[PDB]
Design a protein around this ligand. Sequence first.
Ligand SMILES: Nc1ncnc2c1ncn2[C@@H]1O[C@H](CSCC[C@H](N)C(=O)O)[C@@H](O)[C@H]1O
Ligand SMILES: Nc1ncnc2c1ncn2[C@@H]1O[C@H](CSCC[C@H](N)C(=O)O)[C@@H](O)[C@H]1O
Ligand SMILES: O=[N+]([O-])c1ccc(O)c(Cl)c1
Ligand SMILES: O=[N+]([O-])c1ccc(O)c(Cl)c1
Ligand SMILES: O=[N+]([O-])c1ccc(O)c(Cl)c1
Ligand SMILES: O=[N+]([O-])c1ccc(O)c(Cl)c1
Ligand SMILES: O=[N+]([O-])c1ccc(O)c(Cl)c1
Ligand SMILES: O=[N+]([O-])c1ccc(O)c(Cl)c1
Ligand SMILES: O=[N+]([O-])c1ccc(O)c(Cl)c1
Ligand SMILES: O=[N+]([O-])c1ccc(O)c(Cl)c1
Ligand SMILES: O=[N+]([O-])c1ccc(O)c(Cl)c1
Ligand SMILES: O=[N+]([O-])c1ccc(O)c(Cl)c1
Ligand SMILES: O=[N+]([O-])c1ccc(O)c(Cl)c1
Ligand SMILES: O=[N+]([O-])c1ccc(O)c(Cl)c1
Lengths: 342, 342
Amino acid sequence: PQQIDALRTLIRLGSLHTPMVVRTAATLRLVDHILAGARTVKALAARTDTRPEALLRLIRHLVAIGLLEEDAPGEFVPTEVGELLADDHPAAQRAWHDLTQAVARADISFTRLPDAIRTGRPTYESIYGKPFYEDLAGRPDLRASFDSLLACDQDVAFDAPAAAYDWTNVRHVLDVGGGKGGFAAAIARRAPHVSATVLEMAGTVDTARSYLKDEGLSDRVDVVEGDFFEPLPRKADAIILSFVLLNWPDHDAVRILTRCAEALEPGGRILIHERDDLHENSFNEQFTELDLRMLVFLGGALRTREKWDGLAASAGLVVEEVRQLPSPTIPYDLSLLVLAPA
Amino acid sequence: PQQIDALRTLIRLGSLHTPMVVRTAATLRLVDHILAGARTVKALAARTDTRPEALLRLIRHLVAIGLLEEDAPGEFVPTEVGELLADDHPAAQRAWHDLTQAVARADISFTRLPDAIRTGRPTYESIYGKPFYEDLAGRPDLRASFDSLLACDQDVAFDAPAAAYDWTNVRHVLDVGGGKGGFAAAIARRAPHVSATVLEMAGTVDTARSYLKDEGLSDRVDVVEGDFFEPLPRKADAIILSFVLLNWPDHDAVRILTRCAEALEPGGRILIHERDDLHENSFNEQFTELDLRMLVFLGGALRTREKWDGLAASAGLVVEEVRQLPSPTIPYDLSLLVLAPA
Ligand SMILES: Nc1ncnc2c1ncn2[C@@H]1O[C@H](CSCC[C@H](N)C(=O)O)[C@@H](O)[C@H]1O
Ligand SMILES: Nc1ncnc2c1ncn2[C@@H]1O[C@H](CSCC[C@H](N)C(=O)O)[C@@H](O)[C@H]1O
Ligand SMILES: O=[N+]([O-])c1ccc(O)c(Cl)c1
Ligand SMILES: O=[N+]([O-])c1ccc(O)c(Cl)c1
Ligand SMILES: O=[N+]([O-])c1ccc(O)c(Cl)c1
Ligand SMILES: O=[N+]([O-])c1ccc(O)c(Cl)c1
Ligand SMILES: O=[N+]([O-])c1ccc(O)c(Cl)c1
Ligand SMILES: O=[N+]([O-])c1ccc(O)c(Cl)c1
Ligand SMILES: O=[N+]([O-])c1ccc(O)c(Cl)c1
Ligand SMILES: O=[N+]([O-])c1ccc(O)c(Cl)c1
Ligand SMILES: O=[N+]([O-])c1ccc(O)c(Cl)c1
Ligand SMILES: O=[N+]([O-])c1ccc(O)c(Cl)c1
Ligand SMILES: O=[N+]([O-])c1ccc(O)c(Cl)c1
Ligand SMILES: O=[N+]([O-])c1ccc(O)c(Cl)c1
């Protein structure tokens, strides 16, 4: 029958149990326990305190989708794909799929995706009771998990964009929504003359200070607790917005950009570190995953190249330059947009 | 980099937004509206009352995963795979993925899959407030949706198993949990001498009677409202359990089989219509989808061939024969197990 291939393709794409099986495996640390020697259902059930027959039924789907394989009778081992759920694999995919950590927990928001397409508004609060960052504020453990996930690739998060900008004429940097201070730290290492300030939320500021202290950068990078919708705590030659604006709908993104514009020294620049696909190039799974997460988590959005041109104008800014960043690790197209006063 | 293929494979398998995007498209009847002439985002937003920019973002992922394609600038059409979401396509995949119909609604149970692997118990009640069939009992609209989904393929559901059994020495049939009476009806057509009784729950009995009335079979197939954990309403030469036992854990399945055994005429047989994969043949997506749905919806289970041998023994029965059924439509391996008193 001619449509069976198409049918199977649709059913697979539409299957909700398959990603939940992957995330359940991640959460139970199943692959770690297997690598440590528990290859049978009875051994793995003991290690995870799960019911043996129910665990077998989970394992059966993990084999069907190619994450595990039955090596000997009743003995299971990870495939090349399944091995990526080992806890210390550099892609950190176990943590990214762990239902007790911030992102896979937030992904439950997708169960109300129709509401988000109707309203353009996030569904996270309807599930967890508070909007995303307020929820993280009330759950320091989730805050910590979130901060660690985002920084899982330091070359992409911090080193590549720091290396792609000329800091020679920069004296002061303000990193707005700067997380644990990784970006500010990478700049400081490359540009010894720079002093930097990280503006962040409660909880994150302590992680940031502790990180910078560990790095021996406390004297060059300070951390300020604050709200980037209010006047910024000081002026700067370079103001960093690294994966900040995508958290926000257009009217909020403009407010943040305007606060940054108002804090620029003469000759200063605003640096945006984000995706910037041309619209015609944006129909890809990397763009849509992050963009749709921003919708249901936060009501934010990824902006295509043509939108960035528009957003800058509204904040009294102009796009001076868009620097296509190298991909030092995985092929993941990122840019550094450089904005100047209009 | 050598692991990028494996990484992409894992990320796709683990993606929760992708099936929710498919189910959102199904629920919004997007493909139907496109086929009817709404090919632009602005036309489709009007037809679905969704926010245009949010709908574009949904459509972008539908293109990325190959369900839609951009035909002309800003105009979208279904692919060969996407066309299967048309409402009248025989595979009924739009309805099976519609979040307001019974099954895709029940699939939200998978968001608590770790609890089900730990306990072996369903998560449906924890989401919807009542166990599965009690919830359907309180929502006649969902009951109706459920009954219609299961019967979407009448050749597989009713005609094939009816044609695969010799009714010559059968005078009375009892179809236990017989749904709308489709199986009983198919037997009645093939075996004019048979009288049949459908035992079902409230609500379903009215649909059954109405269906049989429409079929002109009221005089040969009657419908009884009842509970198959209680003594069965009469004796029979053939007792049908078509996709019933998988709804139930082993101890409940044995109780049902025992009630059936207690209602058999001399020489009678119990006919089980279900999957019966050998365990070594069960590591496939058809088996696991249904098996894992039974776990989280109901705490039920698919039984492999070797389990059926064991279950029959416990009910005072013996497997006389397992008839591998033909697949008149899609390749979906089903059997008719014939059980006799031990
Ligand atoms: N109103 C607000 N004021 C200051 N920071 C805020 C804020 N709302 C959200 N944030 C911060 O915005 C950050 C976005 S995550 C970005 C982290 C970092 N710039 C990186 O590239 O890795 C979060 O750390 C969050 O704490
Ligand atoms: N306690 C009970 N007594 C009688 N029927 C029950 C029951 N619990 C569940 N059922 C029925 O069991 C059926 C399982 S669905 C099976 C439908 C049909 N035999 C077919 O093959 O298509 C449902 O229709 C449900 O109403
Ligand atoms: O083709 N498949 O892989 C497939 C999977 C699950 C199903 O329920 C059906 Cl009907 C088919
Ligand atoms: O999947 N990710 O999120 C991810 C990000 C960066 C990486 O270097 C790798 Cl290897 C993986
Ligand atoms: O889940 N993510 O990939 C993700 C990335 C960046 C974010 O700011 C948030 Cl809030 C989530
Ligand atoms: O999509 N993300 O959220 C994400 C997060 C961290 C990364 O290094 C990369 Cl490359 C991507
Ligand atoms: O994809 N993101 O949203 C994201 C956020 C923070 C980061 O450091 C990186 Cl590298 C990526
Ligand atoms: O050329 N350098 O001095 C230099 C310094 C830091 C970097 O990350 C890179 Cl990539 C280069
Ligand atoms: O390789 N991919 O397809 C892919 C998709 C989403 C991601 O966040 C990343 Cl990091 C990679
Ligand atoms: O996917 N299904 O559930 C399904 C079942 C029976 C069919 O004939 C077809 Cl075509 C599809
Ligand atoms: O979702 N399903 O495929 C499905 C099939 C049969 C059932 O009895 C139930 Cl309860 C669900
Ligand atoms: O898996 N199911 O639930 C299911 C339902 C109806 C069918 O015709 C088939 Cl073939 C399969
Ligand atoms: O797969 N099932 O569970 C199922 C249930 C009822 C049916 O009529 C058919 Cl054909 C299949
Ligand atoms: O040979 N017959 O008489 C007959 C009757 C009904 C059927 O469904 C089939 Cl398949 C065959």
